[PDB]
Design a protein around this ligand. Structure first.
Ligand SMILES: Nc1nc2c(ncn2[C@@H]2O[C@H](COP(=O)(O)OP(=O)(O)O)[C@@H](O)[C@H]2O)c(=O)[nH]1
Ligand SMILES: Nc1nc2c(ncn2[C@@H]2O[C@H](COP(=O)(O)OP(=O)(O)O)[C@@H](O)[C@H]2O)c(=O)[nH]1
Ligand SMILES: Nc1nc2c(ncn2[C@@H]2O[C@H](COP(=O)(O)OP(=O)(O)O)[C@@H](O)[C@H]2O)c(=O)[nH]1
Ligand SMILES: Nc1nc2c(ncn2[C@@H]2O[C@H](COP(=O)(O)OP(=O)(O)O)[C@@H](O)[C@H]2O)c(=O)[nH]1
Ligand code: ALF
Ligand code: ALF
Ligand code: ALF
Ligand code: ALF
Ligand SMILES: [Mg+2]
Ligand SMILES: [Mg+2]
Ligand SMILES: [Mg+2]
Ligand SMILES: [Mg+2]
Lengths: 440, 442, 440, 441
């Protein structure tokens, strides 16, 4: 069987670039040295990539001298190969189209290389289980799909920006806003600044330990399961599915958590518990995943399952970003968090649903004396701010100071917002029932 | 030529062990089906098993033989000799659920190779299919195996399964007379009101400044834990030996000063209280002390599993010092050493479903702070503890910092963190002589 | 010659563990993967160690699948080897006895491997001298004796603890204590907390440079040579035997060191010097080793010599723990200090005599502003606190502050004590005569 | 396999002892009859041990008659073996070194004999268990370590120490001390606390840059070359030999450095310069090494050279401890300084002369506001305090404060002293002539 490649297409990219150097700006955007099939073609392009990047003029002799010094000239096929290359394809402007068909053959070749990697790992497991082999197969397949999206990105001209900016103002003015657009948060004061939990964008809710990360995230999921028709998916890594349910019953029935974990509660308290269960089983939107160490592959497979089974998802939530692990970057922690954050943003776009990830801030804010959470304390964990579209921090002054002003009232300080503006929203926190309500 | 992923012994173990015990079919049918079996004779035999056991009819060597004989599949599977040797092989029970998992394991990999070969053959032979078209065809076929995979224990749960499990917990709690205590009794009535007992499977950290009474308060919990709870208590003494712990134990229960014990001088009246202590101690024999200097997170797990398997199961695990514990891999990085030790202790608590009481020390930052009231920030300097912990309680005695401080001889256990319940402060009278923590009245 | 091994004993351990999984708790305590002779037996046990550790059931097929995936099944001897293993030895409970005889053959095999290592190094030295070859032979022999003691340690039931605790209290109440138990320190205020320098336990005296580490250690040895009948051994690494003697004469005669090193002293001063020599030569308990760089093997050999020659030792003292060196762990300093501290504790138990080691604290305490020595400043040097049974620090406030309160009075702050309690003892320091006396 | 032995080494011990009988006193201390490999060599030495012990003269015929009577002469190899033995190795004094290598081969031979004993007992246990075989192996190994009595490093009883200590005090009481003991510093106020620059101990003079580290060190060397008869060695790393000489001429002639570097000075100033040169060339004790980056090996080799050439040294001085480098620990700076400090202390003991090393303190004292040098500021550079026997810091208040009290007077604060006490000595500093003189008032 012959591998998918086109020798004429590889010759057309280099052959037409020797005559016109100006086309390199758009040609380099589509292909690289790795995309070329044969070894002499890879060696020739490796010189092209170096000469044209510096801004130096590229021709038949300038490229020949780069190969002659490295003694690759007699290896590629002498000067006769370079001479026949300039002679062939004297066409211009269509070089961008020639670069697309080189990337086309290379992508299929990379896909077969991954398909054979899965097959060889299947017959020869060497300790690898069915669960381990499933993650290895999907992670390698996603690498081709991830590389296919990193291309064509870069800076933007005013034409594309103005059209996108004016359309945003027009649609906002047209619709009767009332804050809500997309997914309802449940808080009127928050909806004014947030403009609802937008689809396909990554949301990170970060706070100091025992501030109420899981509490506030669940408080969003209470209203997300009630308001939105489509189901809500929750990945509980830290605490089990049972503990989440006790906090859920307390938030909706509005009866203290201490009464639930002990079991002692009167007939009056039981009536509020009874009313909660009824509304919960009418929609059945809530789904909890009580898994200790999830992989970015396992999150994708389980999200696709519920979306295919129940029409489609509405909101995905993660109990802990740090508790998630990647098998490839286990050694490097900085790259582990960077890839997990990159995988969660790509999962949001894949399903067009808001992803609410919970992350913890470094001890730097406690030493800082100000103790008001800043984005810099979260950068110490890994690359989160770059991938995130909306970052909101939970800060309760009653934690640091005993008789602090507005005791029992927390302020959700919005540290980052790509879509809208940044600020701070005060919400009354009821510790007993683990509820976040609108402050008046 | 490559051999497909299958195990003939694993396929034989599922059927072979199910012929003797019919009751196991309830959990075995949950993992595998007729399609999961590799060879044709194995598929024909299981197809009969699936039909006989579903009706509730007894399954044996002849009942299964008659199902095959009527369909003329008996001479095709390998006669009665194949069925006879199947019942003879693997006379083991209960591990049939584990045998069903490895049959599904080989079948899933076999399905994955079938998809991997489908992608490879479509790659070389596109027939109109473009790179974009081939990418969608490859991912959709791979996702079909991940969608069909319905692993129970780890994976998604619908509200129906969760609500039923949650409501059964509240029902059993409302039925039984709670009296505040839920799980493990601390021994202090004022503490039990806020703590709601030492909950199972959650991580508890008792942190204080040196010589405040970390080992003293932890042992004071273990005095009542060995008396109240029927299941044994495990203690890992890293700092001080097993002998020193016992002298503090005898002083706490007999209520005779430690200074009398270490010198040996005590009257007949003092000896009578010592005598009464030993009697109750040897009636239950719940106390277990590990006098090891530098324990590893692997050594803690192995020793905890031993006592749990030998004495039915544990009730409470205690560590004398979190900082004295060491990890061989992260010896160079101290921040990662403490982070992994704290992560290992929480995972050990969940593994045995028992409260783990770890003792940690706070940084000198609180002494410079002038307030000297312990805060969680002083413990974060040691490593990642607050993130893993479920309950953090600090020991603060005002008589240490100030000589004639108000409520002298009374310490306040300030609860810095509680994931399950609320946070506060509980005052308990501290008797330094006998190394006892008792309930304060007033 | 056939190596010491038993194939039936190796087969009996695995063969009886396949049927009864519950026995692994006590079997794993005696043997490991390294103890098995043949390669197929090592591969089979390596699977047993992994499956039973997780808690997963161990049988004929579960173990076969672990080998089949790693392609070790056809290498160990097919399924027929595993089948005949389960058939053989159907006995239970005696598996713990089978594990002991596997460790027995393996220990002798390791001893021969060390015996051949010494013999081959003898004929082929390659730069190694007689002194170098002696240290290499003893260090390798001690490694087998050290591994023989690390086993069978683990958790303890109340039965073993109570019997050991009650025997300690009974013997203490029986004997007329008078504070002192074991070796007399010479200080009445110190003896109350220390309860004498206990036998077989490791003692570390740590302080900041020029605080009086050598001064206080010698002040203990003054009284140790006078009170105790058995001789005292001192390893002087930093200063020579002559300098130690001048400090010794000054401490007992009570005449300033400055008079001795200059030689100018009157008839009244000479009479006190004369009285010192008389008592010194009556017992002759003092022994000084003026060696620059001692090895843990050299310390053991020289300690055994004096103990065998003079009935037995009473107290061993080291001038500097950091000045001692190990030839194997020369590159890694953290492991060098860790092994030296581990060797000194094992030497104390071997001779049942208190070992007084002198160590220096890191500069961290000077930057700390408090300047009161803590155990954390000593951990920076290496693993000392874990091995040590008693740690006492020397802190003189007159060093840091000129007109400090209680000038000429040092406080011996006990940082660690495994046997008894921790505190602080004030002793009057006389810099002139290099004496530590009881403060009143 | 050939057993560890040296026939030439066995021949060298006896061969060189036949000519010089006086060496037996130190040769018998290292080896015995058992240490000799071959049987004829053992028989010959057995006679040597008996004849020389009585005090009888040992030669070719006296030893031959001892063997001839016992009929061992024809067994050892006739008189021809004894004749060729006296002919071979006509060297003397190195016989003690030949005895050490005979004991070296014998100890390894005994170790192999024990190693083979363990191996043979391992394969053939005959009732012996693993616990029994472990005790048998260790007890036999310890027997070689117990028999090993290495002199130079081994244990010393109080009898040998007291006799050596009392002889030191006796010689010191006999000679007129006058406070100064060892090397004269030149300062009367300093000599009272320091008790002279003691031999074989390491001295570190540390101060903040431009305080006068090189100035004070040279001020010690001015008096060290004048008072002490034995030469003084100086390793100038920072500045060259010429710059050191201009500071030297200024200190003794007592004429400002600014006049010397410009060259302008009157006949009155030249007369003081003239008097300096005269006294300098009368003793010629000063030696300067203008090398940029010296290694601890290069310092040892150059110190041994001057000591062997000029009878022996008196004081070794280093311009900069930090400027010195080690080729092995080039990457790790903390270990570089630690080994350099350890090498300089071992060099001091090797030559029994005070080593004056100059080191710089960290910027921590400037931030501290007190600015009075403490030992903690020097620990940041490396491991110096642990190796050092005497540390003295230079602190001038006129540097930090313009009109500071006692302007032109520096205080040498003694931070460490293992031998004597710690304090502070005030000395008047004359910046012009780069002189440190005794302060009065
Ligand atoms: N008053 C009260 N507070 C509670 C109760 N249960 C939990 N809390 C508080 O609710 C918060 C829970 O925060 P959580 O989300 O689990 O922590 P995080 O995810 O680390 O930020 C903590 O501040 C607890 O003190 C309860 O029963 N009563
Ligand atoms: N009055 C008195 N106090 C004692 C006695 N024994 C111990 N203590 C005190 O009890 C406390 C023991 O604390 P400990 O748990 O060992 O220290 P930690 O683990 O570092 O906090 C200290 O405050 C001691 O002063 C005794 O016999 N009498
Ligand atoms: N007053 C006085 N102090 C002295 C004399 N000799 C030594 N010292 C002091 O005694 C101490 C000796 O400490 P040393 O044990 O050698 O140092 P370390 O081992 O590094 O702690 C130092 O503080 C010296 O200053 C002396 O003759 N007079
Ligand atoms: N007044 C005056 N001071 C001088 C003269 N030459 C040098 N000095 C001072 O003498 C000192 C020399 O110190 P030096 O030992 O070289 O520096 P260090 O080794 O870094 O401490 C400095 O404080 C200079 O300012 C001079 O001609 N006149
Ligand atoms: F302490 Al948490 F999520 F409960 F960081
Ligand atoms: F001082 Al402690 F446990 F006894 F920290
Ligand atoms: F300075 Al030292 F022992 F004399 F550390
Ligand atoms: F500045 Al310098 F020696 F001259 F440190
Ligand atoms: Mg959480
Ligand atoms: Mg403790
Ligand atoms: Mg010392
Ligand atoms: Mg200088």
């Amino acid at each position: 069987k012959v591998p998918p490649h086109s020798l004429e297409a590889e010759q057309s990219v280099i052959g037409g670039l020797l005559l016109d150097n100006e086309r390199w700006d758009t040609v380099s955007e589509h292909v690289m040295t790795q995309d070329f099939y044969s070894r002499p073609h890879r060696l020739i392009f490796d010189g092209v990539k170096s000469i044209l990047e510096a801004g130096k003029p590229l021709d038949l002799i300038t490229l020949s001298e780069y190969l002659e010094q490295r003694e690759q000239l007699e290896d590629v096929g002498g000067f006769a190969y370079l001479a026949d290359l300039a002679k062939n394809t004297p066409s211009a402007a269509n070089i961008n189209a020639y670069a697309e068909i080189v990337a086309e053959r290379a992508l299929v070749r990379n896909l077969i290389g991954v398909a054979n990697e899965i097959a060889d790992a299947g017959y020869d497991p060497q300790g690898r289980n069915a669960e381990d082999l499933l993650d290895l197969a999907e992670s390698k397949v996603f690498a081709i799909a991830e590389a296919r999206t990193s291309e064509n990105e870069g800076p933007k001209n005013v034409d594309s920006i103005l059209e996108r900016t004016l359309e945003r103002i027009e649609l906002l003015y047209k619709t009767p806003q009332d804050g809500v657009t997309g997914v309802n948060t449940g808080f009127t004061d928050l909806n004014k600044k947030t403009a609802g939990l937008q689809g396909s964008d990554l949301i990170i809710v970060a706070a100091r330990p025992s501030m109420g990360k899981t509490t506030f995230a669940m408080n969003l999921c209470e209203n997300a399961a009630m308001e939105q028709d489509k189901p809500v998916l929750i990945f509980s890594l830290e605490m089990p599915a049972e503990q989440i349910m006790m906090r859920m019953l307390a938030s909706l029935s509005r009866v203290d958590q201490t009464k639930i974990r002990t079991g002692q509660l009167d007939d009056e308290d039981w009536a509020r518990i009874s009313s909660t269960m009824g509304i919960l089983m009418e929609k059945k939107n809530m789904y909890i995943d009580d898994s200790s160490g999830l992989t970015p592959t396992e999150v994708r497979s389980r999200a696709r399952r519920i979306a295919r089974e129940h029409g489609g998802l509405s909101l995905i939530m993660v109990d802990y970003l740090q508790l998630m692990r990647v098998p490839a970057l286990t050694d490097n922690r900085t790259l582990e968090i960077a890839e997990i954050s990159r995988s969660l943003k790509a999962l949001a776009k894949e399903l067009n649903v808001p992803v609410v990830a919970l992350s913890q801030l470094n001890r730097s804010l406690e030493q800082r004396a100000d103790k008001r959470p800043v984005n810099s304390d979260l950068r110490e964990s890994g690359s989160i701010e770059q991938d995130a579209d909306l970052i909101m921090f939970i800060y309760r002054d009653e934690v640091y100071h005993p008789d602090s002003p507005l005791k029992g009232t927390a302020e959700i300080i919005i540290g980052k917002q790509r879509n809208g503006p940044i600020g701070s929203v005060r919400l009354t926190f009821q510790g007993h029932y683990s509820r976040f309500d609108n402050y008046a």
